[PDB]
Design a protein around this nucleic acid. Sequence first.
RNA 1: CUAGUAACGGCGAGUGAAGCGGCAACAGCUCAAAUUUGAAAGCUGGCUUCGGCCCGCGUUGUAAUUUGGAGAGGAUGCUUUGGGCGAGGCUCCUUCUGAGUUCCCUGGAACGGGACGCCACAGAGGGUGAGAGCCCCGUAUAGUUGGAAGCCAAGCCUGUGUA
RNA 2: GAGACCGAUAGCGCACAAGUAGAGUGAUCGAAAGAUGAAAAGCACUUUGAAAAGAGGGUUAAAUAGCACGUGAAAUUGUUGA
RNA 3: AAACUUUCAACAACGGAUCUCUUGGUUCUGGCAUCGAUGAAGAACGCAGCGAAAUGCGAUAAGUAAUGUGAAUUGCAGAAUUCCGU
Lengths: 50, 67, 121, 117, 134, 74
Amino acid sequence: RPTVTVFGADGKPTGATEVLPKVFSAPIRPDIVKHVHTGMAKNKRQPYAV
Amino acid sequence: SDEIVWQIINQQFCAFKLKTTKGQNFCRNEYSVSGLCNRQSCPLANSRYATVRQSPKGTIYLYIKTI
Amino acid sequence: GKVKAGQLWSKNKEELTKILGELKTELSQLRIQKISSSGAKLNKIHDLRKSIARVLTVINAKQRAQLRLFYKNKKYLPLDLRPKLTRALRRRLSKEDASRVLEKTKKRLTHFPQRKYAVKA
Amino acid sequence: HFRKHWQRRVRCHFDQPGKKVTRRLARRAKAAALAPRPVDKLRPIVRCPTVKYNRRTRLGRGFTLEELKAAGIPRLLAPTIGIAVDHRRKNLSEESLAANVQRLKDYKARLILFPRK
Amino acid sequence: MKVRPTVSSSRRKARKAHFSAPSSVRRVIMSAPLSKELREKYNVRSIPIRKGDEVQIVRGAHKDKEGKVTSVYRLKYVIHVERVTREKATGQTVPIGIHPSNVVITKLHLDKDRENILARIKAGREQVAKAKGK
Amino acid sequence: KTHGLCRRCGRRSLHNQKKVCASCGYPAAKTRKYNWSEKAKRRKVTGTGRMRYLSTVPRRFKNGFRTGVPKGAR
RNA sequence: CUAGUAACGGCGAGUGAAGCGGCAACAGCUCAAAUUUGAAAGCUGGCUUCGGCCCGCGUUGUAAUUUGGAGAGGAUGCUUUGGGCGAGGCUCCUUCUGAGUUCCCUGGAACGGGACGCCACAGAGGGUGAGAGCCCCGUAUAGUUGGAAGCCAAGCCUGUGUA
RNA sequence: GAGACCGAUAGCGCACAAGUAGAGUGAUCGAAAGAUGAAAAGCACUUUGAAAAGAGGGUUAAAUAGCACGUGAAAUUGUUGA
RNA sequence: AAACUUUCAACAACGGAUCUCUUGGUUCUGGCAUCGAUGAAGAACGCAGCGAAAUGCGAUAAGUAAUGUGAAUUGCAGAAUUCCGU
Ligand SMILES: [Zn+2]
Ligand SMILES: [Zn+2]
């Protein structure tokens, strides 16, 4: 799809449209997302020991 | 990209998926002809789809989704 | 029974030492007759003790202030009147000694001080 | 290489995000004191010693006396206007001299100076 | 959510501070809402309770019971109200504990410090409404 | 009896014949303390007693070790 | 990072750097070695009407000048100043600042369920007779009342000696 | 100020009288032990009798929650029935 | 036939597991730099009507002065002590 419609403050279409960027046509890779998200969620962690 | 959408839903996660120990999986989507999580009856993976639902006034409607 | 400290500060020295004697002779006479039926006498003893402390505080504060008026020109204050601080704070260099600098250093600061400037983009 | 007690002498770095905040606050604390001035002093352009890094060029410690006098900056004024001064370094070639008296001349063009009192 | 670093979101530090509080800050905790009539006249929502306050219980098994405060027990976070009592086994009538958050103050016990409290809340509430309005 | 009352540490660890404490070493100016007994250190360390003067130091530092009286006080 | 490199090794066990390079931070100075010699110019104490008087130290050396990528002394001509108040501001403590206890049901008790609202730069947390943004303390935001000590400082008084 | 930590045989030895109680001539060694209920309303009164105990009766939503107190497993034990 | 023993069930004991809780611990991070001959740290002896295997204090002894708040303390006795008020 070339364009995406821009909606107004009232919820109705304004009449202006924007072109969808190329990042929305990128590959969708669940294996990549899962691998990164597993290590990403570890990066906030705060150490514990006895 | 209907095959890619099925690969995310079936293998990873679906919010409408009910898993039982009895060997069959169930679909909790209200727009499903059969409450089962197979490929032929997924409202999400199938861009063109049909279902039949009942209004509380008693009227039966045919819901058609097009891509 | 209890004497407010507001009346305490206004009076002079001989009025304090007479009232302190009046509380002390009263306090001693209570405990002789407090050993039997220690009821409201025990509450009076608690109020008598607190009033003795308030009187003794005003006498000491007046005497210490009179000493600090006497030593206002002398340079050797008694040890009880000097400030406590800490031990190490009392052996630190004075504010004027540590701020003292050589004549060569003052000459360079007078004629070449740190300037105030900026660099444009 | 764990023959000695490496258990008693192991250092982690969980203060790495916290030390960066302190270091950036120290640069902000310094710029509050030196409010129109830049944080860091001007430094000269020098050539790296060895044969491995002869072709590379880095910032030095301070400007030579001959570089300051050629640019027109007096020696006793330079530390008070943001110019670092090195008495140990020598010039030894006209290429080291000309690169730095261009840098000091470029510093003066971009410098705005305010009177004393 | 919380922003300032001095603020703590610890349940442990909050529960320790509530149950080990001094009676000065127990007073602020032991505070009650004012009535609809008292809100529209003093422009004040909530003040701490003192002994002379006529009050009305609006939560608990003793709902819709009105009376004067008999005691402000800060050690157990309890107020006592006139004629809100139960009998022991012996027949002796004991005060029943109502928390200050379960009552609405109907009449204040006014002294010079109380009008100063009521003025300072009204001054701040008027100031921010003016600052928000204009 | 081998040991008697010690004036410094208050225990019955003062040897009668030698007149030297087994716990603190009373005739010695220094208090006996060894690093191979961390438990013995924490038994006599600062904070295990009254802390009679050292408790007052943190509050006075917070105020800058000030001296004087508040303005307009009686 | 160099780097388990160089080096040393019953050359087995093994031990084990540094220079260069990228960064973080940056700041430079004080004496002794000189003759103030046309003037010990320096300093500790004591008494003090606080203003300035005595004793002592010290010439076997206390000030000023100088500290080797320097310096001194002449000469010459340009360029630089010194004190005291001080409005006000920053830091930190404090005072105050939003909205339902509306109706029904269960319940010993609503803080639960249902209906209708409200606040939100505040739906962090805690208490309250059971899961509470709107019952209470707090929390967010700028302000605002009072105060403490440091620092800075607009300005305003004076400056002076062939320094 | 926090936590992808532990949750009363755990987590510091110590959530509580914890370097306490206790042991040793001494240096030293060093425990066990949290939880009624929303609120003590912590069982008035009658009646057994010498007791950290019953039978009535009462409080409480509940007393088979009675300061042996939330829940109350198993080992083990008693009574009744097959 | 009793008893005794065994198994199972109900009820009643013993014991304190399991579930739930947490004014405790553990670990990390951040701001700051303050003991003592002006007598510290530590050790005793005392001060409250009933009190410790607590806490506070020092013959001014569960405390006095001063400032702020503004109406308590509380297990029971007990205070003509204080409420438009130094
Ligand atoms: Zn599905
Ligand atoms: Zn000893």
